[PDB]
């Protein structure tokens, strides 16, 4: 009874930069070829969504943001073979087309069909499925999850376990997978190793989780906010250090604590200075440092290339380095098998309509993660 | 009739920064336990030796420099098991003690017994085997090959094929191995890949040879000096580009040429700007950039971490990433098996006594490599 027809529903539209989200009645067009319309069940509030508001992550406005989410398929357009009406799904802000240079590469995941490098804010076909009072509203990262219903291209959605709790697994759409993959996929943390995680928010916690699943012997949480330590240890951190406690630079403290440098360091914060600090605190000959947060408005950092000449490896990634469509279902499966817990990351749950409160919570730093429910 | 006794011989002593090498009669003391006295047959002039002259590379003076060489063991001290009087050997400026954390790591090679990080200019026991007119002279990187005879610690020498041409395999002591390993050991260039090599001196040529051995489909030579192109092609370059020919930045032309970025890039020059350019011209999602030259006096480079966030990997290494004692013999073996050639790298050959000329040749840029002979 909705298939093939425009659906009228509510969405959170951002009409202009630096403005609160406006809950509006919007029209969601039915899926065209290879597209999938999804009824949203839950969506997380991610810092990246806030960068849009800030005009820091440039993408065309007005837009429906939101990229970390889970829902149920309402209908599919022609030619769609990977999901069916009724399936539980997670939108993939990093698509997996399967055919570009990158998707075919054993090590690449940044699919060239992405709307991140040069944001267009549309469907793959250059159009939008969203209107508010006749006016076109843009899409965001091919997902647009801050709406009761969205339409995404098939390469930007993955089918997940029919028994999954969507209020929890939605985190796999961004925050968790980013942190988790940084450790298990990008760094390739090894058993018995020593790890240093800079930034103990939601993503840093997921890094710890990855280091633990990988069997790290030591995981040193680093953060200037000691209130983050309890939860960090709770998910696997062996120790926690607050750089503000020390009279010496933190790379020194970490090098000395790890008897010469750690095996693996992670910067999840996106700070120029900590990214360099994190690089230096890894062992000079075989240490690996992984970054996962870089604000779209980043200036250039300044570092000494001698940090690299000795043997260090520096790398970054998007979405934890996971090929999205392949990985998302496996991660949910892992969750369903009770291999890792997501609850520690969820500190707040609010009905969708209270989105702006959820953003206040994000900006204040009070929450690790707010989940919005429909 | 020299074993157990002091040997009087000639060496090139550098008495003070910024002065010509002085050929002096020097006394070379007998080898103590786990030490090896070597009669030099050939040694290359490497940029890093010039850095000592310039004070770029800080190490105690007065000193006998030289770290790229080959020779024949004159005698061994007590406890030595890896080489015997009469063996052809190559000093390892990067030691392989085999017992430290780095030597035991599958990926590390910058052995913690090195005298590079904090140069002391002695044998491992903190003393020197050199005197000139009774004054002690320092060692350099535990090799000191600018002498008719040197004494090195056992962990800093490797035995090689008894049939090797020392005038040529000496290059394996530094220049060749550094470039060749950057490709085959550090980057792990794969078959059918596209590589970009910035800097076509001896080290870059060696990089090219490794890309070729690894089966690279394309190897693009980059240098502002077109007189380097012929040799680069001779050793494997499929094409050569000169940044000065273009009205746009080289990373752009390289990205366009490789249809979205190259698989592997190498900076062998040691320039802050080209290091960053090299990084940027590799594919954003799975590209790898490897540096091999960082002047001891290097400033901080400036780069945007957004280059790493997409999926790029940035690394450096000393000695081509090779575990020195294990690798050197195998490289000579490959040479002897006709796997690669060294002739193309040798442009000048001078009697040891003409060391200062060889350095003029290096400073002018007119040699790829000068080899000195005894
Ligand atoms: O990613 P996310 O979405 O989880 O964002 P997030 O804001 O939840 O994570 C940021 C974390 O980094 C910490 N931090 C800020 N500056 C720091 C510094 N200089 N050194 C160490 N920690 C620092 C904050 O206290 C916070 O815990
Ligand atoms: O010892 P070694 O072999 O490392 O040193 P080398 O001197 O033999 O190699 C340096 C090379 O880099 C080239 N070069 C200098 N600046 C450059 C730039 N901006 N872009 C491209 N090439 C540049 C020079 O022409 C030279 O061929
Ligand atoms: Zn996100
Ligand atoms: Zn793709
Ligand atoms: Zn060692
Ligand atoms: Zn050298």
From Swiss-Prot, chains A, B:
Domain of life: Eukaryota
Protein residues bound to Zn(2+) 2: 97, 100, 103, 111
Chief location category: cytoplasm
UniProt remark on cofactor binding: Binds 2 Zn(2+) ions per subunit.
Pfam families per UniProt: ADH_N, ADH_zinc_N
GO cellular-component term (any): cytosol
Binding site for an alcohol: 48, 67
Quaternary context: Dimer of identical or non-identical chains of two types (E and S) coded by 2 separate genes at different loci.
Full protein name: Alcohol dehydrogenase E chain
Lineage of the species this protein comes from: Eukaryota, Metazoa, Chordata, Craniata, Vertebrata
